[PDB]
């Protein structure tokens, strides 16, 4: 069983039902309603003043609604964080996802949130990437070199960094 994990997050997919999500995540780790509306929010290990977590959004409140949104914090580590303030400064609004990644480093990023508001269409897809310098990521504490890069339709709309070089 265990708490929410990166492995479970990856196994959960866009297009899944609420029951499918709960079955992979482990229902005892999850909640809905209250602060989270009709999304499902699942806790991982303790981190900082909260927990690593995943949040799954659905196309509607219906039992057969599908996952159209996946978000996570501290469930996944970057592959090869090579981000630097320099590379961050090379990133420009209007850039493609490919252009951005080539700039910051192909293993510098994880997916913070990804939402298909027109699911199953990709139109208007919004994506937030969490990217990290060599020692910037932490799964249990606080980042020491990270950036938020956000996109609509696969094109960069904005960027923000903390603690880079």
């Amino acid at each position: 069983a265990g708490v929410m994990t990166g492995a479970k997050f990856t196994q959960i997919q866009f297009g899944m039902t609420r029951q499918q999500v709960l079955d992979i995540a482990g229902a005892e780790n999850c909640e809905t309603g209250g602060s989270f509306g009709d999304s499902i929010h699942c806790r991982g290990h303790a981190a900082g003043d909260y927990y690593a977590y995943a949040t799954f959004g659905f196309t509607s409140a219906a039992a057969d609604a599908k996952v159209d949104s996946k978000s996570q914090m501290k469930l996944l580590a970057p592959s090869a964080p090579t981000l630097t303030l320099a590379k961050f400064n090379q990133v420009t609004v209007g850039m493609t996802r490919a252009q951005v990644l080539a700039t910051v480093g192909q293993g510098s990023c994880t997916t913070w949130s990804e939402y298909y508001p027109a699911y199953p269409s990709t139109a208007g897809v919004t994506l937030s990437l969490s990217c990290f310098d060599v020692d910037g990521y932490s799964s249990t504490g606080f980042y020491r070199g990270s950036a938020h890069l956000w996109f609509t339709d696969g094109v960069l709309q904005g960027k923000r960094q903390w603690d880079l070089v």
Partner: protein, 265 residues
């Protein structure tokens, strides 16, 4: 089971850290037990009770409504924002933002609220206005958690924080409805399990707010008492220790347990 100051000395010795603690009678404001009470400690998320105090003050004055919807953007999102990040597309009400900030230490929620009261400078001016001349907020989330050694930014003292909490929750300064609301958000705290709640006896009341920061910073502010009624304010802060989160939580819980064991001694 050690007396509170004995337990604190054991904790500093074991952690190589500095602990700050005040135990204050809620009704009278008298200081009952104190340790490094005039030293500065990073507030971390404990500042959010003061933040929402300032928000409620505006509500009382007719300058704010808890039902007012705030819409925000990707630009506004920072780490540790589980609730505000979920509601990005829809917005959140002021009251929903305070609930997220207090009960779940939601960082972006706190930043959004901070803008409504004039930013860190504005919140600091509110503190000065209620007679707290010590506590200061200088930065936004997430930098305010950096806890660099000797840095006075975003710090309080146990003495000042205890007095300020007493002022916010029990003095003339907020309306009865606002006091009840601030207290209710603290009662509904979701992230404080490993701290005082872990050693709180059956039948006691607790309302609290926690914080965690870099360089070992950790803290809790709480109102608690027997017979399901608040009797005292307890503030415990830790700074400057390389110890694990598990060890830091256990020590704070242990200090809480000592205060409880020696409640009438």
């Amino acid at each position: 089971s050690p007396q509170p100051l004995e337990q604190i000395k054991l904790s500093e010795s074991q952690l190589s850290g500095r602990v700050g603690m005040i135990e204050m009678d809620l009704a009278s404001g008298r200081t009952l037990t104190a340790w490094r009470a005039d030293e500065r400690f990073p507030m971390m998320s404990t500042f959010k009770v003061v933040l929402c105090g300032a928000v409620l003050a505006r509500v009382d004055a007719g300058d704010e409504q808890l039902e007012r919807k705030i819409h925000y953007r990707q630009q506004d999102l920072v780490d540790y924002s589980p609730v505000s990040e979920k509601h990005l597309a829809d917005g959140m009400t002021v009251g929903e933002l305070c609930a997220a900030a207090i009960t779940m230490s939601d960082n972006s929620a706190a930043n959004l609220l901070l803008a409504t009261v004039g930013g860190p400078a504005g919140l600091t001016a509110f503190l000065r206005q209620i007679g707290d001349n010590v506590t200061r907020l200088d930065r936004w989330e997430t930098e305010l958690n950096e806890a660099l050694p000797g840095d006075a930014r975003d710090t309080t003292t146990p003495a000042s924080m205890a007095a300020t909490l007493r002022k916010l929750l029990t003095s003339q300064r907020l309306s009865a409805r606002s006091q009840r609301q601030l207290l209710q958000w603290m009662v509904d705290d979701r992230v404080a399990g490993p701290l005082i709640r872990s050693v709180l006896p059956a039948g006691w009341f607790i309302a609290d707010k926690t914080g965690a920061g870099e360089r070992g910073a950790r803290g809790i502010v709480a109102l608690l008492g027997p017979n399901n009624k608040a009797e005292r304010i307890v503030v415990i802060y830790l700074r400057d220790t390389p110890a694990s989160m598990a060890e830091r939580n256990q020590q704070i819980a242990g200090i809480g347990a000592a205060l409880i064991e020696h409640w009438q001694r």
